[PDB]
Each structure stands twice: as C-alpha cells, then as structure tokens.
Amino acid sequence: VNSFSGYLKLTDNVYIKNADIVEEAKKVKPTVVVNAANVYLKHGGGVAGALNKATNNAMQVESDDYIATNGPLKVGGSCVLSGHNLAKHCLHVVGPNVNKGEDIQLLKSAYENFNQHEVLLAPLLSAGIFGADPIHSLRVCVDTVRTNVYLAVFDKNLYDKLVSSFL
Numbered sequence: 001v002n003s004f005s006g007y008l009k010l011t012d013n014v015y016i017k018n019a020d021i022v023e024e025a026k027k028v029k030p031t032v033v034v035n036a037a038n039v040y041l042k043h044g045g046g047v048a049g050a051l052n053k054a055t056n057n058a059m060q061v062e063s064d065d066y067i068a069t070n071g072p073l074k075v076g077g078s079c080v081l082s083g084h085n086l087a088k089h090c091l092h093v094v095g096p097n098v099n100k101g102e103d104i105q106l107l108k109s110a111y112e113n114f115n116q117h118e119v120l121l122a123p124l125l126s127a128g129i130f131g132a133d134p135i136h137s138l139r140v141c142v143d144t145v146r147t148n149v150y151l152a153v154f155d156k157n158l159y160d161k162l163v164s165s166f167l
C-alpha cells in the first residue's frame with residue numbers, strides 16, 4: 001500500500017492520473033519524482049521548468065554543479081539527484097526531443113531507467129515540448145517499465161484521450 005490517490009490502473013504496475021506533477025509531488029512526497037530532463041540539466045520549461053521553479057531554483061543550482069563535475073548526460077540516460085522539497089530523490093531522465101531530431105527508439109532506453117526504482121511518480125517521457133506522440137510514450141512505458149509507476153498527465157483533454165485509446 002502507498003499514498004498515491006485517484007489513479008486509474010492501466011496494468012499490473014502502471015497507474016495514470018490527470019494531475020500537475022508539481023502539486024502531486026508536493027502532496028505525496030514520493031521517494032522518486034522523475035524529471036523530463038535534457039542532457040545539460042537546463043530546466044527551462046515544460047515539466048523541468050515547473051519542477052525547478054517549485055524548488056526555488058535549488059534544482060538548477062545542484063544540476064549546474066553536477067554538469068560541471070560530470071559533463072552532459074546521454075539521450076536515453078539519467079542521473080539521481082536530490083528531490084529537494086518535492087521528493088526524496090529526483091531521477092532526471094532524458095527522453096529524445098523530436099524537435100531536435102533525436103531517435104525516437106531511444107525512448108525505450110529512457111524508460112528503462114525507471115526499472116532501477118521500485119516506485120516512481122513520473123510524466124510521460126518525450127511528451128509535451130519534447131515533441132513525441134504521448135500515446136506512443138504511454139505504450140512504450142507500459143511495455144518497458146516493470147516497477148510501479150504513477151503517471152501524472154497535466155492536460156485533462158490529453159489524459160482522457162490516453163485512457164480512451166489505451167489497449
């Protein structure tokens with residue numbers, strides 16, 4: 001039993017809700033919140049901009065130190081950093097950005113990072129400003145993640161379409 005509330009159950013391990021991931025993280029304080037990161041951990045917009053704003057820019061300060069030490073992530077890769085006031089940890093995961101021409105096949109590799117964590121609150125990778133089809137992202141999530149994932153979908157219209165079209 002966990003503290004996530006109001007989710008629709010899609011499969012044995014995947015759950016979905018129309019919610020603002022920022023507000024959901026603040027309420028649940030999950031062990032792991034996933035960020036829709038880029039390789040530079042520049043949290044300017046989309047989910048990343050919203051999460052970083054909610055940390056009062058502390059996420060960005062920590063991220064800049066991480067990059068100065070380690071260099072950029074790989075597309076499809078991840079790193080674990082602090083969750084600040086939102087979660088114990090933040091798993092920064094880089095899905096391919098279609099608006100940059102990146103290989104959509106890397107979306108499966110991106111979701112594989114979730115399997116290193118027993119339970120996660122997450123957005124759909126590569127959705128939103130990353131330009132991929134969210135219906136496809138949900139399919140890859142369900143077919144790749146084996147740990148327990150609670151997906152927050154900000155847009156109500158998109159949420160209803162994801163549910164109604166789910167096979």
Ligand SMILES: C[C@]1(Nc2ncnc3[nH]c4cc(F)ccc4c23)C[C@@H](O)C1
Binds near residue numbers: 022
């Ligand atoms: C992939 C999508 N991104 C989000 N998913 C979950 N929670 C979110 N909160 C946000 C706050 C913001 F200021 C900007 C984007 C998001 C966002 C779902 C769809 O709407 C684009």
Ligand SMILES: [Cl-]
Binds near residue numbers: 046128
């Ligand atoms: Cl977005």
